[PDB]
Amino acid sequence: MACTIQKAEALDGAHLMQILWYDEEESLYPAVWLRDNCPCSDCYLDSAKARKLLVEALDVNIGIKGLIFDRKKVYITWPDEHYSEFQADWLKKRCFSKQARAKLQRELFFPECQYWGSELQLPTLDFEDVLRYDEHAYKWLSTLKKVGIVRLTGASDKPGEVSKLGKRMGFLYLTFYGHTWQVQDKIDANNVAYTTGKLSFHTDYPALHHPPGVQLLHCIKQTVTGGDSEIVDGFNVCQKLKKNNPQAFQILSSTFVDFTDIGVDYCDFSVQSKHKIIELDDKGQVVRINFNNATRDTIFDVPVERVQPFYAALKEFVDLMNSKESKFTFKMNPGDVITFDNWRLLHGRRSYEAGTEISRHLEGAYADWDVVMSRLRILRQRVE
Amino acid sequence: MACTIQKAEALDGAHLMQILWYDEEESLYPAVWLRDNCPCSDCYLDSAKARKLLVEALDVNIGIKGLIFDRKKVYITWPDEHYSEFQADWLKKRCFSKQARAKLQRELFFPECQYWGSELQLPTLDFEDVLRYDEHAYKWLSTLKKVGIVRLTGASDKPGEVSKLGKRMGFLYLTFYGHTWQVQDKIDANNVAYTTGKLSFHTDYPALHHPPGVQLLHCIKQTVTGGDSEIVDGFNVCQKLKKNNPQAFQILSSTFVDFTDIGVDYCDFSVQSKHKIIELDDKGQVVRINFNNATRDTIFDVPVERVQPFYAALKEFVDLMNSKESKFTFKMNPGDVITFDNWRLLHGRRSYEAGTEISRHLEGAYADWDVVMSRLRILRQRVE
Numbered sequence: 001m002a003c004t005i006q007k008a009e010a011l012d013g014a015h016l017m018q019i020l021w022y023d024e025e026e027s028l029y030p031a032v033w034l035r036d037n038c039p040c041s042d043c044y045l046d047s048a049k050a051r052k053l054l055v056e057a058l059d060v061n062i063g064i065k066g067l068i069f070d071r072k073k074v075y076i077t078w079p080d081e082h083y084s085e086f087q088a089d090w091l092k093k094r095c096f097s098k099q100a101r102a103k104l105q106r107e108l109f110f111p112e113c114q115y116w117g118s119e120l121q122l123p124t125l126d127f128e129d130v131l132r133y134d135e136h137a138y139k140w141l142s143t144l145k146k147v148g149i150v151r152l153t154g155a156s157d158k159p160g161e162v163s164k165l166g167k168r169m170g171f172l173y174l175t176f177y178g179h180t181w182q183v184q185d186k187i188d189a190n191n192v193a194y195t196t197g198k199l200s201f202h203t204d205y206p207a208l209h210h211p212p213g214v215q216l217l218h219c220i221k222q223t224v225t226g227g228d229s230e231i232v233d234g235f236n237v238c239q240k241l242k243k244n245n246p247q248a249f250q251i252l253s254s255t256f257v258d259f260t261d262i263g264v265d266y267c268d269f270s271v272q273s274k275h276k277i278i279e280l281d282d283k284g285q286v287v288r289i290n291f292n293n294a295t296r297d298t299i300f301d302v303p304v305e306r307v308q309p310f311y312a313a314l315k316e317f318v319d320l321m322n323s324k325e326s327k328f329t330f331k332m333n334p335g336d337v338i339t340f341d342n343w344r345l346l347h348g349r350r351s352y353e354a355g356t357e358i359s360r361h362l363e364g365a366y367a368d369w370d371v372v373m374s375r376l377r378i379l380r381q382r383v384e
Numbered sequence: 385m386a387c388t389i390q391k392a393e394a395l396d397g398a399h400l401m402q403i404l405w406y407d408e409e410e411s412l413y414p415a416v417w418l419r420d421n422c423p424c425s426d427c428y429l430d431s432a433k434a435r436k437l438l439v440e441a442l443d444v445n446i447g448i449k450g451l452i453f454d455r456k457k458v459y460i461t462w463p464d465e466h467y468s469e470f471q472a473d474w475l476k477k478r479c480f481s482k483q484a485r486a487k488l489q490r491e492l493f494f495p496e497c498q499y500w501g502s503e504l505q506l507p508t509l510d511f512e513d514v515l516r517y518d519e520h521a522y523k524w525l526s527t528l529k530k531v532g533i534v535r536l537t538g539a540s541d542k543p544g545e546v547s548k549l550g551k552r553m554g555f556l557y558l559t560f561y562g563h564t565w566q567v568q569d570k571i572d573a574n575n576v577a578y579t580t581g582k583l584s585f586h587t588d589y590p591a592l593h594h595p596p597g598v599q600l601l602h603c604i605k606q607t608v609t610g611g612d613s614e615i616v617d618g619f620n621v622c623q624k625l626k627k628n629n630p631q632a633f634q635i636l637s638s639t640f641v642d643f644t645d646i647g648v649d650y651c652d653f654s655v656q657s658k659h660k661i662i663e664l665d666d667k668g669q670v671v672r673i674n675f676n677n678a679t680r681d682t683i684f685d686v687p688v689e690r691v692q693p694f695y696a697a698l699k700e701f702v703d704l705m706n707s708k709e710s711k712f713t714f715k716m717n718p719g720d721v722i723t724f725d726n727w728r729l730l731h732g733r734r735s736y737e738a739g740t741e742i743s744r745h746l747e748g749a750y751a752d753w754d755v756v757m758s759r760l761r762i763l764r765q766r767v768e
């Protein structure tokens with residue numbers, strides 16, 4: 001009833017098509033949009049699922065010259081004698097009503113978000129199951145998107161496990177630190193992460209204008225002397241900050257902070273960026289946190305009078321993150337892999353003791369959210 | 385005179401340090417910023433050039449307890465007995481005056497831009513020279529940044545040349561189309577670029593939320609039947625559009641357009657994004673164009689009444705690009721490589737004739753602007 005055509009007609013000087021569906025709901029489709037989206041072989045390359053029609057070929061003042069229909073299709077003639085057919089189900093999906101557009105956006109981008117604090121139950125799946133079964137890999141990426149973190153247990157205690165997960169997703173995101181990288185204490189460390197020091201809450205790689213969307217960390221070796229993990233839900237924290245200190249939120253969401261990374265690893269590098277620590281979309285919603293206190297530059301590109309208020313705001317944000325109601329602490333064992341949203345979560349590590357042998361070794365990698373989302377879309381289709 | 389300290393003192397309840405330089409100019413440094421940027425080994429990891437000091441350790445209401453100085457250094461005691469030394473040259477560079485901050489930003493990000501239209505003289509360098517000499521690679525990337533395109537002549541007519549340029553920069557940007565990819569007519573083409581068809585002005589890969597910053601295209605084989613290249617300076621075009629049709633500019637700079645790419649190449653993919661075609665920074669300056677008419681989705685997530693005005697605006701933008709005063713046309717020969725800013729330029733190709741043998745073959749790749757800028761910073765240092 002809902003996707004069967006009861007009537008189709010051209011309206012508004014023939015600039016709109018109206019469909020009355022068999023449930024009595026109506027949908028409206030601008031003529032210019034219909035013409036732009038003609039699925040014929042002249043206009044559309046089926047092997048690519050892509051538009052061949054050029055903007056230059058589109059008459060933006062076009063109207064429908066003739067229309068007939070049956071229950072499942074509309075058949076249109078255009079003023080220049082071009083001819084198009086549209087399927088009812090295809091039309092129904094693309095209905096310009098707010099409800100229809102919103103449903104479809106939800107299907108494309110999986111916006112469902114579950115905020116959490118210290119009560120978090122760490123979502124956990126088996127490593128080999130995720131590699132082997134689409135049902136398990138689907139639960140993995142869907143939960144990663146919704147909650148922001150999934151622990152995978154039962155991987156080996158040798159290098160190469162993150163690279164498997166990389167292939168399962170698609171491919172990993174190369175940076176100056178390598179295709180994958182080893183978190184261990186290193187002589188002449190090129191990064192604070194490669195020491196035994198504490199890492200306070202941070203996101204990885206704000207020195208890039210497009211920080212890694214997803215991070216993977218695999219525990220090869222763990223130390224008993226410290227090195228526990230800590231995470232916080234940055235979107236939850238930002239919401240709390242906006243309520244408790246709107247001025248602190250305003251400053252952190254509007255001030256461009258410079259980040260820097262200079263050194264040598266996979267290649268020699270001298271990297272500089274600017275980010276707002278709390279990054280909002282055009283509707284004021286938080287979409288990314290960009291903050292690593294190690295790589296925040298000494299250079300600070302703001303008028304003098306804005307400096308101390310910035311630091312006061314940063315301090316409030318960091319104190320919120322550290323609150324016992326916000327943070328979740330846990331410890332990785334060998335064979336554990338954590339995979340998390342590096343745009344939303346902030347993560348940290350407790351200091352541990354240095355010594356002559358390597359007491360602690362994680363292998364890590366990054367993936368682009370678009371690569372992850374692509375796999376998520378494909379997995380959903382295969383599982384449903 | 386300019387970087388020699390004549391006087392240093394604590395002011396404003398000791399919350400600011402003022403330096404009077406030997407040229408009689410004054411600079412001001414907030415105490416909290418000084419403390420945050422203590423270069424001692426407790427606060428700062430020299431091997432990493434990174435801050436160890438945590439936000440949690442920073443008293444945002446800190447003032448200077450004591451200060452002495454000589455011509456080249458200031459020596460500060462803090463209320464908790466921490467002790468810091470700062471060098472005059474380091475201070476001078478980081479002066480919070482608008483002039484000093486702006487100079488430094490120019491040094492970090494190379495903002496100099498030369499807009500062009502059909503009068504463009506295509507900047508051209510030798511391929512092997514760029515691989516061999518830092519002077520030539522510096523001219524390459526600096527010109528790429530400033531003008532938006534450089535042609536390199538005298539490469540071979542075999543695959544593997546873009547990969548050399550990749551290593552010269554650092555590394556290339558992997559996508560679903562491969563580490564590098566072959567632009568040729570293909571049976572069951574997964575993309576319109578892999579056909580003999582015309583490509584209208586576009587940017588590459590708006591189906592990604594972070595499109596490739598820099599594109600490389602190397603001509604292995606060229607056809608006499610068509611396949612000329614065309615480019616336009618998108619920042620120049622946007623400026624013209626803002627003047628001729630502010631409403632068209634407003635629409636294209638505020639409307640989120642959906643892009644899509646589904647298929648199989650390096651991996652299987654189902655990619656979706658949203659972009660504003662004219663993407664502005666927080667000051668209203670154009671920073672990226674996101675537009676490929678082939679990969680613009682059939683899905684269009686806007687209220688019905690906004691649809692036809694969007695298309696009318698797009699048409700005006702495309703007509704401007706196509707204007708004889710804006711576009712620059714040229715033809716690649718075997719051994720030519722073009723390298724260009726895929727955020728600023730739009731590029732295209734003329735159709736050519738299909739046949740039984742391959743008549744036309746380019747090898748292409750992408751690089752991230754941050755990777756390119758890093759090399760540019762290093763090269764400038766080595767050359768100066």
Ligand SMILES: CC[N+](C)(C)NCCC(=O)O
Nearest residue numbers: 177191193204205206292
């Ligand atoms: C590359 C992995 N590593 C060193 C753990 N982190 C890089 C990101 C960062 O320093 O912010």
Ligand SMILES: CC[N+](C)(C)NCCC(=O)O
Nearest residue numbers: 561575577588589590676
């Ligand atoms: C990957 C290279 N290729 C096919 C030439 N272009 C991809 C970007 C695009 O379709 O917009």
Ligand SMILES: O=C(O)CNC(=O)C(=O)O
Nearest residue numbers: 183193199204347348349
């Ligand atoms: O070592 C850990 O537990 C966590 N490491 C990091 O956050 C890092 O390397 O960026």
Ligand SMILES: O=C(O)CNC(=O)C(=O)O
Nearest residue numbers: 567577583588731732733
């Ligand atoms: O084939 C050409 O001349 C140019 N190709 C493209 O713009 C492309 O493949 O994206």
Ligand SMILES: NCCCCCCN
Nearest residue numbers: 068069070073075083
């Ligand atoms: N069911 C209607 C089919 C119309 C075909 C028209 C071809 N020009």
Ligand SMILES: NCCCCCCN
Nearest residue numbers: 452453454457459467
């Ligand atoms: N030139 C002044 C040196 C001061 C050293 C102080 C160490 N606490």
Ligand SMILES: [Zn+2]
Nearest residue numbers: 003004088089
């Ligand atoms: Zn139906």
Ligand SMILES: [Zn+2]
Nearest residue numbers: 038040042043
């Ligand atoms: Zn058609």
Ligand SMILES: [Zn+2]
Nearest residue numbers: 202203204347
């Ligand atoms: Zn980290």
Ligand SMILES: [Zn+2]
Nearest residue numbers: 266267268554
């Ligand atoms: Zn290298």
Ligand SMILES: [Zn+2]
Nearest residue numbers: 387388472473
């Ligand atoms: Zn000096």
Ligand SMILES: [Zn+2]
Nearest residue numbers: 422424426427
């Ligand atoms: Zn110190």
Ligand SMILES: [Zn+2]
Nearest residue numbers: 586587588731
């Ligand atoms: Zn292209």
Ligand SMILES: [Zn+2]
Nearest residue numbers: 170650651652
């Ligand atoms: Zn694959």
